[model samples]
Target chain A: RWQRALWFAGVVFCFGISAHQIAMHVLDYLSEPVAVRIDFVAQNELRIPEITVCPRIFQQNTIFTDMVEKQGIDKMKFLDLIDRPEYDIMAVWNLSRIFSDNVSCSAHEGSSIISGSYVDPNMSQPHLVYTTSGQCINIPASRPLIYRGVNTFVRITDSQPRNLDEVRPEAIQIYFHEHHHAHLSRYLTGLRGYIVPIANPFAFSIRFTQINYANRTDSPCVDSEEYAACVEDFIEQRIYEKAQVQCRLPYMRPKLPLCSTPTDARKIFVATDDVIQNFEKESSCKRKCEENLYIVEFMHLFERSNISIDMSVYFAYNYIQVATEYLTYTLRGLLSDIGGVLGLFLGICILSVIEVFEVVIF
Target chain B: RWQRALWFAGVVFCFGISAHQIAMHVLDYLSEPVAVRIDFVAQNELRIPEITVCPRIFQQNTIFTDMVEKQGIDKMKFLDLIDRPEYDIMAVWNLSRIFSDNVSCSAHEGSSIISGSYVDPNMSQPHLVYTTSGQCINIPASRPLIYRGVNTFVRITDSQPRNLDEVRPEAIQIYFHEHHHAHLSRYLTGLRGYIVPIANPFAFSIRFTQINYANRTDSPCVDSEEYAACVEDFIEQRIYEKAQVQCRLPYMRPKLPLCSTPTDARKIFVATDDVIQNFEKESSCKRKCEENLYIVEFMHLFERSNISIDMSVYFAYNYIQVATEYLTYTLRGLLSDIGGVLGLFLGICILSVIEVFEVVIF
Candidate 1:
């Protein structure tokens, strides 16, 4: 009888242990970690191939112009134009060779040897080559340090670039004319044919500045019109000037074999202190101009419809897009998937089991 | 020279510490935790004054009616109904108490006394007091278990009591009739108005099944008028036959001393389960009927005006209320004061002193 009781108890204990294990396994499956795959690409080389091909320059310009019209101009009123620093355009290009070895190999050996002479020996020539005899060659190739540039542009007119490459020069000329009013048309008009070198064959960065014209009356402009024109012109002129500076830079020598592609080029330009300080001083003036314009247009609109313009909604949409995309791309991928699920499961299985056993025994 | 350096360092350190402390003090003064106060009066001894005063019989009925309309009348449906117990009314009452201390305190005292009573010899006459305290008490007393019963009534009715002392017996009767129908009421009504000899109030737990009925409906009748009359006739006949069973339940006793001004009685009667549960079921049914009637009326209105009722704004008002109140109460309070301004000043002072010393050392 004692033996029978012991056997019965053993069977019960085994069943209980099995059930507990099964329960734990079921829970583990339910709360399983979600695996995520991420491919890191350099910011410069991170191109949406569809967008870069035929390149949506007009679309980009329209989008930027619309953004400025909606947010930039309105924000200008509240901004201290004098204290505000001149805008700086920094162009970054990702070297694709750093992204994938296969792409790099194909791009190098494909069109690399042009007329028996190396086009970009430092970049195109293999650093390490292995022969059928198992002999290896390690070449010491000089790598160029990546360059980033900031440039200011001048806006003389609302004329937009027909293509991405045209933006830099056109912006520079516009900004210069608007700021100096020196009518550099004689010197610059013929120079219009010159192309502003790009960081890559793909994208360009455009920046604007707030300039204080010494003789304000020299430019025929209303408060709003002048301010807008000034910003655009400053950006254009600064960009053109910066590009000229970049062209003169010692490191920008075309003698370097690997520096063949436009992507190898780098540019940086910052707006002068005088321009930013001027805008800060004129900030109050801009505000007054905005108020006067509102009275002229908004008063009638308010009377016609009992609703004022809700500018917040427009900004809210942009903010939502930025915040959501940031979370989805950055936080969700990095923290939620990797740290949240996998860590939680491992923690439950390992830590909880140890804790439960400790409780049961001691 | 060493001593001089040590003295200088001590002075600088002390100044930094003092400044930090002062700044923290200033911030604490500027932003203090706001206190929310609620005051309530207890004229009667009952813990839940609100439940006793204004009973939510109508609301309970509506809930019951709504349920029946949504789920067709059937035994299986009734069984399922018991499974997913509707507890929103209970939630609302609980939430209301959180904001108002007066209601909570009163309800606590009443509930405690009702759950279990003890004899107190301190008074001229032997009096029953809460088992928990066993003494004379005031407001803000610990919540007693007796209040749990009162909470049940609030849970069923989801409506605020107006007077704390009013009991709606009619509402209770209507609820019972709808929920139990002719059979249960026939047995209970037969025992109404009878004086029963009771030796001990605490010894007996009241049971509905014990009621004796002279005439009870045996079949589910189809004719609405005949069935209604039969139910009424059954109740009258039962009441004439067994009066002793009806007298088993004692009338609600006053919460305070009976000698106290009857007009100023603060005690409220806590509705029984039969009353609360039945009322809730019938109330739900009634609401459904009303909603159906309204829908038909709305269709007619839409046909006449060529405009449909746009219920997109159904929850709009609620959202607006929540947003406005949240901003005004919580958000505004959060943004009202700047913290640690004095600390900021102290930090600046310490930094300045360090800068001066550094220059001197150099």
Candidate 2:
């Protein structure tokens, strides 16, 4: 009777300790810890970033000269020309032809995007786009930088160099970004307005660094803190109903004016001060999840005042590409952790645990 | 008797299957599979890299003008000056004063290295170093870029711009590298000769990316493939004994000639063609274990021809720094795997395995 009692006590004590330890391990595994880690991916996996160049030369010089000469106005008074009550602010944006008229794209060694033939219209030539800054020319990378001896180059000329005015800047703003996010707002983002002086031969080399967060897609809009803040503001301002109608209606019939003038058309190029402040604050907020940053390094091979501008961009290093990725505890990882814990404590595998569950169900 | 015979067969079969599975798991664990993973470390833990700038202006204009006037030599024939037997090539190196004399370092908000008083001599000012390219001014980041509004700026001036000759280039070669490996060979490395034109107010922002390998230190010389190749060549050439003696003797007596002229000093600034080829080949070899690459992005900001050069160097983004690290299966991980495998097969814990060992010892 004493031997049997001792056996019962041993079984209860051992099982109780094992169950406690196993329960703790399983709970910890369910917590889902993340390991923020970094590793390298090869260049073959990388796609070249979108390149955009916006010349500070705003309006076409020929048109500007004709307008100024015809109106008997000084080049210095051009700012006043746009603010005049008779003409609209959109007229200034319309006269901007220097970007599309003067810019040209070409590459050596049969590189398809700029040099060779393309099935897609977007890949055939430089695409002209406008932002708050001015008219700019953009090129999306059609292919990765895998071919040897291929040089992706662009040349921009001030064909009417003699007609250049004091109001124009001598430099151009360059942007390096991902193709998917190529919007007007991207041109105004941080470090996007990289200035490159004209009349010089510029050679730029890019190395890409990427970062991604795991389980970001599992939750609704968990990646961007800015998105949450903006949504909260929308509700607080009681503009959610209006915004939903305005945003949803646009996709149905996408016909819009070349430029929309607000009811309160404050001074030219001016907006509501409060709205401007809010927009700036929103733009400054950081993204929590995905990022593809292009690290640009350049060399000014030589400069020439007589000529316009020449730029050659290529990948500097291709063997290794850097990426920061999150190693999150997935369902499989959690299951593995549970199995290890059970092995350490109760000396039972996942099958044994399932057997217990089956017996309970049966 | 029939039930007992069936029980013996079941016991033997279960044990045999358990032994096979457990053995496979243990063997695989011992194989030491490595996971090449990447992760991020915060900026607080990062150290700023070394920055070196070598001006293409080899000789100070004042000295060059004086020397030319005194010797009655044409500015174009300055290259021919060193080749003369009476004068040595070392004279040209000594006369190079543009980098050391004209470059000035200062920072805005009481930053320690360039602006404040230092306990160490090396931390006090920009150290002048000589490379194959020319004399360069180097500033090791005495501290990380953590302080707000602390602008690290360097001003380089052409005090005698009027005395500039046509032989000199209008740019400077800037290098980004680590402090420990700041050798003469570094300036000649790929992507190191980043040329920045003078007379421009340049602002450069650096983003760093690091890569490292695991078990690099386990073996005596496993990290660098180039090191192994060079060692093999050393033995093949039968110069191992001579090299060992020369390398060891250097610690005892360090005094050496600044400009050692060979028996046939063929031409000034020239060397053996075969030796040059070998050196170039060796220099091109990549490092296998460690790398700290600075991704430099800059803006011309604005240019002024009258004033020589003003440059501001700062970190672009510092919240998260990227690094590529290797994850190796360690002893602890192996033991965990073993426990899981054993429990899956024989329904035994780590303690049970130890108990078996104890019984064997007895």
Candidate 3:
């Protein structure tokens, strides 16, 4: 029994000293910055030059919006693909039409620039809605989108807004709808804007587009008469389909087979704008544009762009988050991490709070 | 030696059976339902009746939209300093602005309806870009937005959109954004449209609105002349903020700050529509609108006046999720869960996995 107590004390001592050392190591880990490498795994079907991410991780270049490290390019590398291996990474991605690394250059005064810029070597919070595949919204994605690997910041190359033809509209309407997660990562700390870290983040894998909408997606199908037919047929199909969750309300007979689509979809835009801005602002309620229509931006196959990022910070110990580690996050790999230190130096497994409870109770 | 071998054999037999039983129990745990309680903790200072939630879970009402089940009347239960409880549940939320119960009602066909209403008690899917306190867009939160507990589906109640003054236009936009997600969810399947189960779900909180020129946010402040000026001011303010991530690059002398809101914010309505639409037919893309400007529709707050019901589904479960029992979502909960089960029931500890790697050599 005494020998067992001695072993426990030894383990406790080693764990204590190792825990302190690991504590310091955590600071460096938290302080260490991160970066991202966007590589398009599929071939030449898509090319979007403007992508958006936390600008803090990007570094701009001089002269042109393009750059090279030494093996000087024979020509300008505009929205080019480089599938080379990067040094130390935390994740790897394979995407269908994730944005490219390039943004078309702008003149000094600026007419329109890209989502993130290199104006400040340390500029961080990315602001733009990032016309994520703006060029391809009209184009159907024949493949899966990819965004993997971890911690590679700034100096990001390029991606485009749209394929010139499909670009004009989406850029002007970031309206929040259907419980839109208007979660902005801006630094308006006092005003409720969260400045997100480029820490281990995941992508939102959303299934975005499809085929069959058009022979080549003409206007008839996008609007008016065609839209009406589409809604009717769509609802007719729903009638035969099964249910997911049931609606067992009283005085309620669900009239299924929803048969409609407002071609005047643009009406919602004017009305929504009028309401939100009525928030003590002096903007006129009237939309002074040439037309008054309900607008619904639609494209072809990008729907299956059914891809988005999902962030899991298993050992995510960032600078601010670490202060309340127990409350915010605990080192998931604690046993492994601490064991690495204690076991490597001494030779014992680190006992956790649970282990203590375990032994005491058993 | 034989006695020691005998002991090892007994231990293995016990572990094997328990592991099998524990595995079976895990399925039941997954089978267990989740419920959520959405209470409006504060009174008067904020009266937003239009909150939107993903419809993975919601239950429609046959009994009431506003009930007097026990006490019943005009005066509502007040907030007279009962700030106890809520000592825990911080990390319970990671993804921003997830929601539970709450939202107001309204009516206007060919335009807006309550978020989850097609003006029906059993209208399973919800469609509205809920007005989440448009008045307090600039106010920073002092307390945590608490949306604790979890699931159920179909019917839900109250959160308002458009104050009496702003009610005119938004519903139509909701009409458009409405058809968008409708197209996504109605698929009954096939259609990528996901009629999101209003069952207990996640929330997304974002900070919108801009600084600099506010003559109605043109781009120069969407409501201004040099949208770049707004972007510049925004970026300049960002420079002083120490937190968040960064950027690095060469030949990327990018200029200008961004001054835009979520335009693709409207994109989702359409994507969701397509998903729900996958339940039926194929393609077409044409804007048959007689006018170009997006239109708007209006009405009174309870305009629909056609009463539906609200459900309090504090606990919910879906087909894909709800299987694993990890307690809270952080890394700590995971360890505790696995540890509690393996150690207490299986007569072993999850820590042992870490032990082999700690002191064992290949």
Candidate 4:
């Protein structure tokens, strides 16, 4: 009996040690549930991102000239009155054109795209689009194009009168868009704004990233016992709400309403303090399941008169940076580990069950 | 005996299946071997890299003017004759000064280093250093400095007579250096060359990477039965030789001999075909244990006269991209898996061994 007790105690002690080790292994796996690796991947095929450019002076020249002449207000004073009660909201919005009639999809006649060794003559041009910033020209990457290096570029040139700006700013604004769900709201404010100073020759380059997140089981969005903060950064605000976070858009519209609407435009310019407050209400925003982000860096901007401008946009590198989130401790691996721990402690094998079966049947 | 033979066959069959499964697992681990994870890490502190700038012209102004007046050689003709047999080798090497007497570390009076909101005065100018590219002004990052963003920049300005350029090209050549092993030749050629055209205000930005490689036990350098290629890329040539690879320096003198030597300078320009052939002898080079690489992109250069120049260098982002190599299948993991497989097939546990002990002793 004493020997039996000593043997049983020895077995239990070994089981205890094995259980502790297995528990620690599981805890380690839980601590770092998934791995997020950022890798530089070579581009198999290339698709240029959507690009949009808006003029700094939102008001059309014809409207501006008439307003200056009829209102008996100086060029600067005309801007002050546009948002005031004296001016009709619709009429003000109507006159507020981001680009002049002279500019169109095909009007930037010299607009060009160079692919590899081939110098594509002015074949395709950026189409006209309306957004929060008003009317602008945009080039949507419709198809996969094979092009790489600094030599490949999209060139745009805009010319205007020098005096147009002393009256106001004639500089142009630009941004890139590449999004999922084809929703404009996701691209709303996240599309960063860049300005091309009036008449200056500007050049810039872009690099992009493709990211994917782990499933809900792996990445929690709610506060937990130890990790109180489960906030991830979603580059867009609308997507933040989907992640179960409180986030308000630029305005009080139910959906991603266009700024072209008189009320939204009006709210943006003379937006109430409460409306502004709602946008910044949430201290943090969460990341999404999948994301495509573009990083634009300004390379060169040569200053000159405000009469004309030249701009070139190109890719910074030939590769796409990818970040993928994956479960480091898989279910199959966990089951295998458990089996190993059980065997190490108890020395239980399939042959033992077969021996008992044979003995009983005989 | 027949029943016992049947039981033996059954056990042998189970062992065969288990052995195969274990082999497959081991093979899978062997195939992958290790994992190389690239991560973007935020900067806790920053250390700026060393920068070197060399003038395109090798000869000093005083020497060039004297040669033209005395030797009756046109400026272009002087260049032609210098590399030819007529000029004495030592005299030619002596005359080959990259910068004029007027230039020094402090001569670029307006040279500046801006750290965040603080705009430092003309303090701590780049010291003069002689490199393979001839005489240059270098600012070595001797100590750790905490600064980030586009706001931080190293500005260098050089003013010269425009006529000197019509006589020749006054474009200044530039390169950045951040290396380990404290050897000059390791920095010899991997340092990519850039040019600051005469009198043009040039601006460029920098982004860097830090990488670590797995140990020799994991990464093989010799060809085997399956993988015919075991090549790694060592950015520096001298280091390539230590990795059991045949590589020759630019000049034949043992070690990394300076280009200042008259024999070496002559050999580089009028280098024998065999000497050049030796450098490119190897079909491929291998990677090293660690590496620090820099990527430079040219920004703006406005067309102007050849009188002066302005150059600004800034960091692209405030974070360092890191890549770490690690063994995915450790020896401990392999042993654990083997133990698990053995117990699963044979049903052997610590309790079974103790039962055997009791049977033998009692």
Candidate 5:
């Protein structure tokens, strides 16, 4: 009887110890740290010649308008506004011009002169010029009249009345002529403004032709015009796609009845002038212009000659609205719901009401 | 010049090939299949056993009363009402008596009962007595008095009570006695309710002693009584916490009224007999009883005598609540925010505007 009792006690003790250890180990394993990896990418696609302009619009037109309205513009205040980094339109424009020139030169190998002097037909002197110059001068009679195919120039500005409308339409016409004549002195003297209105059209046409020639040639090498046009077209497509998705708008949504056609699209250009004047009054105009120029330079690489690039108030308004809606509604809505459910379930598991039992009762 | 041109071509071709390969690999990787895993767990920690009593009360009273009221006192209807498998109360009582007899006979490892006869207290041989000129004679019984227990008699009557309130107090007493007797037979009776009322001072003294003994015990095993009590306490804590979190009750707030003492907590059981009956009527009583039995068994395996069991409803409740809140408000909230941002960015990338630029230089 004594030996039997001792044997039973020993067995029970061993079993109890084993069970305890097993249970503890199981609990430990259950509570082991789990690692979760999260990878995040930027919300926008990578574009070559990285340049952004829309944010500048917000800073210049929206933010500055409010500031000016609240605090009437004094000279000191205006200077303060001009001192802001975002208000440096000239700097932005210069940078944009530089970037455009670099991209142009690269596309054309060493042959293209992106930044050079342009003589204005109305100006007195023929002078060597850099692309960053805002002024257009006439070519001197002494200089040779040389036309080397199509020379394209791009300028981005708000269509604000203060910036463009305050000046005579003839001045604008003269500016275009002077710049063209400076580049193609004799050839452009009589043919000024004969081609397209905006420099973008000419650039687009030149690039498209070059691309076609390059692709058709046996050797794959082509002129800078082809390279620039192809690059610009690719970049533009990517940016457009990103903007559309962000706004939750279809890539090809039907144009609003308010501004359905290209002609109607041009009518919305009136807002651009208002926006520009607003920027100028607030001293953020220069910065806004510069930013716009930079974006154009970046976006130019993606432009296709066959397609017309028209960014107007109507398109921007629609896109912005769609983007905001997506952010505020769809994304946030789904997240909150999913999070709530998951949280409830996790809470239950952590509490042992529904206990997990696994015993090796051997 | 020719050599230089050849070198340039080679470089361009190599770069083009490399870029193509990289793009293809990246696209392929992105296209690979991915899946998300979801796990679900309960939100409350209360053991189902303690809650089982609520169901049983309803089943025996309200459900039974309803059945009897709707269907007359037919055996088939009674069976249907209770949803019993095969055995009726009489059959079960007989089985219990037999089991007791077997237990007594096998009480010792090497023991057996000699064949004998005993009279049944409730039944007699009236015909034999009449044949013997009205001289009374005892009928032979197969079991002894002690072995017969409370199962040897049957009372039959018409029109059983339809409601718990209609049940005689004597019937309730008998029911309690029978339940205790069954526990005693199993050698699993607790001292608190059996020897002294659970509220009595003596019972408290005994409990304090038992708790001390448990604290001193090194064994990890927990007996049935202690296990049941601990689990019940844990469950109560769990339910209270869940209610506090989920109820959004107007009266409940950050600083809840403290129970002051364990006795104060007993207010939860302060419902009148009518209320208890009503609850039982609405609940699944049999399932609750079965759940209680399961809990009892589990306690027996886990709660050991002479072992200090650190049990606290507060600790368990707090831990569970913290885990739940963390998952719901913190982790999930952050994850959802991230997902929203990512989704928005992705949408933008896919749908934005594209500018195709084509240049033709003549």
Candidate 6:
């Protein structure tokens, strides 16, 4: 009987040390105020694509000048444009690129309405883009950054008039017409909340200054064949300028390669789409388009009425993109998480009760 | 001997239940993924003042044209302008209030270098503001939403050339005059970033049609005393329009009262500085100023210059917020959280091992 008691003491000694250490460790973690948690992650997304190819530029149909006569496509129907075959001059032709738009990939995240409260005046049709996540070390040093957001569309998300315009041409709409969404926003109740809540005109306006133009002067008007040429010129130089900027940015640890594709806009000198399309031998036009055409990729984005963009912001330093991914953290995760720690926190104190029992119950 | 063995069994049985129950309960909490973290709230901080009172407008002492001829304080020095005595003409005048712009409050958060990577071409100095918490009940009630982001300052934030000129005179600088920062931005060595990222012209430009002008007419040109009045008239009307929008936003359960007090600009505007200084009779201007003013409190923010905001997205519907908040469990939170959970999985199981030993030894 005395031997049994000694054996009990030895075994209890080991148990006490193990229980105390485990219990205390668990308590320390739960007591922490801020819970470091991972909400959810996304995949298979596209943002600013490195290669911006105007498939229509090469299409032998549709006259360029026809665009001028065709009252600028009503923007409200942009989404309908990309999906509709009427605009895809190549629709009847067999232009196959193995993968087509709408082919969502598991490797990349799909599109979805942003999971946020009222982002009022947001005319943007944003989607979940597949760009890699980042942090001090989470991002890979070896892999090059890619943009996976709007594959076939572009957008002007806000209808509110922005006072600044660097490279384009468009005047603010008059109240008699469509006065910015601000004029008609009386429809939004309190569903979407304001980020600023309010503005101070006198304070902010005191500093408002005059025009500071970027490269390529702004056109007095953007219409007809003239405007088309003007836009092409702007795109060419802009692509060139951006290439220079992206060229080996300092501290850009991994020098990002500047990539570009030859565009057919200038080759056709943008003659009414029919002239270039009908020409049997597509030589001179293709030659010049190819001549001036050099290799630079990525910084190419074109605009037109038919396509609306999935909202994406680019932090160029690192082709870092933030897009939405699938979510649904189940109660199962919560319940199991709970079962594991049922008595963990009061964990230590209850243990003391057992220890005291050992001394007295004996 | 059997009696002793029975005591050992009974004690071990009680401990097994205690340890299991305690550990499970604690485990439950740690396992749940979302903590529903509430970051710091904000209020009473002044980025934009509610009152559009033109300081020194009545100053028989200062001239209105003084602002025009003043070459409009170089915006680059805005952080400097707010603190200068020269601009505040009300400096000699004393107008005290419970709050001031410089008076940083604890209620809302203060500014911090954003916790993450670069934002690219961000010239606007943003604040990390803290304000009152939120309310959910009435997101459905009928009330219009107002946008406080781009008041007038947005015109200057983007270096792009603005078409409308309520004020300001010139066009640009040679490399030639004083070029805007967008010029040397080639210097960005992958540090802090630009917000515009890559301005994809084709993607956004196609949709850039039709001008939706604001309440004020688009200006042909801005010059002389006439333009100044036009600017002021525009400013006054903009103020009235916003106040009506903010009047009674329902479901904004936290009726965060609009708050304001005598800013240095107001102190100078009301002529209270000299009055409190000399303790003299009030002028028609001071009397009108005092009479027109009343009291209320809430926070106001402007877009450009001062206060770079953190990128945080919030879901509107409560169910949506929680569903996203609560995540799938895989023992990911608790077990994985316990750090060295590989040997740790059978942690509770270890207690069982200890239990059998208790019975055998006794």
Chain B TM-scores, listed for every candidate in order, come to 0.18, 0.64, 0.22, 0.64, 0.18, 0.20
Candidate 6 per-residue C-alpha lDDT over B174-286 given as tens digits, one digit per residue, 9 for 90 to 100? 01001122111111111111122111111100000111111112212222234333432333233334343322111111233321222422322223222222322321111
Q: lDDT tens string, model 2, A188-291?
A: 32123455555455667666666665554432224444543543343223322323222211101122222223222222123211222234233433444665
Off by over 4 Å in 3: A1-362, B1-9, B21-332, B346-362
**DockQ of all candidate complexes:** 0.00, 0.12, 0.01, 0.11, 0.00, 0.03
Q: Tens digits of per-residue lDDT for model 5 on A268-305?
A: 22222232222213321111100100101011232423
| Candidate 2, number of clashes | 5
- Every model: iRMSD: 40.9, 10.3, 21.6, 9.5, 52.4, 19.2
Highest TM-score: give the candidate number: 4
Looking at candidate 3, what is the lDDT of residue B5? 100
Docking class of 2: incorrect
- Please estimate how well model 5 matches the true structure, expressed as its whole-model Cα lDDT: 0.23
The deviation in Å at residue A240 for candidate 3 is 69
Cα distance off (Å), candidate 2, residue A27: 5.3
Q: Please provide, for model 3 over B145-198, each residue's C-alpha lDDT reduced to its tens digit, 9 standing for 90 to 100.
A: 212101111224444332342212111001111122221112121211123222
**Alpha-carbon local distance difference test for all models:** 0.23, 0.47, 0.24, 0.49, 0.23, 0.23
Alpha-carbon shift of residue B152 in model 6 (angstroms): 21
lDDT per residue (tens digit) for residues A88-162 in model 3? 011111111233433222111111236432222232222223121111111111121122211111122123443
Q: Better model by DockQ, 2 or 6?
A: 2
| Predicted structure with the largest DockQ when compared to the true one | 2
